[PDB]
Every structure is written in C-alpha cells, then in structure tokens.
Design a protein around this ligand. Structure first.
Ligand SMILES: [Cl-]
Ligand SMILES: [Zn+2]
Length: 257
C-alpha cells in the first residue's frame, strides 16, 4: 500500500497516481519574499460555531476527525474562495523530531507538524464529486510549533490511546475545531492538490501565517500512534509528510502586507 517509507513513500506515488508529477501539486515552499500581497482578497470567514464532529479514526496514514457535512454547519467562505465550503475532516502531518513534520515550508523552514482542515465546495453537492473539480476543495493549513500546550488540542490527544493502530476508530462528538486556530487569519493562498493519494488537483490552499504552539507532551502523543494494523510489526506513525513539490507556473498570494 502507499505510505511514507523507503519502499512505498512519496517518491513512489507517481506510479499509481501519475498526477503526482502534475502541474499543481502540493505542498510547496512558500517563499515569503516572492508571494504577492493581493489587496483584493477578502477576509477569510471561518464559521465553525455549529460544527458537528462524529468520529476519530486512525487511517494508517494520519488520524482524522470527521464531521457531519450534510448541512452548512462548519464552513469556510471569503478569502480567495467563491461560494461556501463545508468542513469534512481534519488531520495532521508530523515528524520524528521537532524540526520536521510540516508539509508546506516557509522560506524552507519546516515546522513540527501541520494541521489540515479539509472542506469541499457545496456547488458540487458531495465530496466525491468535488474531488473531480479544479475548485472542488479548500484546505486550511495551520503550522504547529513546540512551545506551550494548545488547550483546544488536548481532547484529541487524550483519545489517541484508543486508536493506536490502523482501522481503529472512536466516538468523537462535541469537538470544537475553533480551539485549533491561531489568533490571526492572515494567510497565503495558491492552487494545489491533496497531499495524499489520489493527489487530486482540486484544492485551493489557505495556509495561515501564524502557527499554533503545542506542547512537547502533545506531540509525543502523536508519535505513539502506529502506521500498522493491530498485531503487525510496530512501525511508529512519524514523518507522515510529503515534501515540497515544484511550484511550476504558480503564484502564491498573501492576504497581508
Ligand atoms: Cl507495504
Ligand atoms: Zn493533509
């Protein structure tokens, strides 16, 4: 199966998913001195007050919290986006050490981890149809650095013991994703792709400039998860990140000066 190891990792993905070598792949390095301030972007609207979380799952490549996306309950609008994008799930990418783990980089800087909140465009009616459109998805990306604990992450951290191995899931209702956001909504944006197979070139990326800090204990708990299924040789779920891909003929825009 695809993964992050020497024999199944990102350099192999193109064989089953040739779009891996496509024209708008993610992640990318964000060169902050080349990104263009765009005074015409709108402020981004993040409306998570009615969010309805459902489950938490170890999918063998990350852990993910899934939401009810049957109505406009937790949505992203504005910024570079036209229309309304519904939150389907969030997940993380992280490292074996604190100096790597993020997918996007900022002037080549890697963060300890990166949070992806994955949304789909309601004009396409469901996520599977949205996945086939060039404007079907929007991913809000948030960097994590190690420092003080993030209180709004702690309920996630405390359930990870119950989903150690691939295919395990647990109830995860009443989780508020507002507790994962930094103060500022200043962002970079560019057109890109999902960073895991199928690597679909349908994502408007919105990457926040301000990281959140998480504690060393919080990230240690991420690193106790397993890639493997129950009973298989233990292979810690660490370094589940795709490295930066070629920018090609894209422009990164900034919402701030
Ligand atoms: Cl394998
Ligand atoms: Zn991701």
């Amino acid at each position: 199966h695809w993964g992050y190891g020497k024999h199944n990792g990102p350099e192999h993905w193109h064989k089953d998913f040739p779009i891996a070598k496509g024209e708008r792949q993610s992640p990318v390095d964000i060169d902050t001195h080349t990104a263009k301030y765009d005074p015409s972007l709108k402020p981004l609207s993040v409306s998570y007050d009615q969010a309805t979380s459902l489950r938490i799952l170890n999918n063998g490549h990350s852990f993910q919290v899934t939401f009810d996306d049957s109505q406009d309950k937790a949505v992203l609008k504005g910024g570079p986006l036209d229309g309304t994008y519904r939150l389907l799930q969030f997940h993380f990418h992280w490292g074996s050490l604190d100096g790597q783990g993020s997918e996007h980089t900022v002037d080549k800087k890697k963060y300890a981890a990166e949070l992806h909140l994955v949304h789909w465009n309601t004009k396409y009616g469901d996520v599977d149809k949205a996945l086939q459109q060039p404007d079907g998805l929007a991913v809000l990306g948030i960097f994590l650095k190690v420092g003080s604990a993030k209180p709004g992450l702690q309920k996630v951290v405390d359930v990870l013991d119950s989903i150690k191995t691939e295919g395990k899931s647990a109830d995860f209702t009443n989780f508020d994703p507002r507790g994962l956001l930094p103060e500022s909504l200043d962002y970079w944006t560019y057109p890109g792709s999902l960073t895991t197979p199928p690597l679909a070139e349908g994502v408007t990326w919105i990457v926040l400039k301000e990281p959140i800090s998480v504690s060393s204990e919080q990230v240690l708990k991420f690193r106790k998860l397993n890639f493997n299924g129950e009973g298989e040789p233990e292979e810690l779920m660490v370094d589940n990140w795709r490295p930066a891909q070629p920018l090609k003929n894209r422009q990164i825009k900034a919402s701030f000066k």
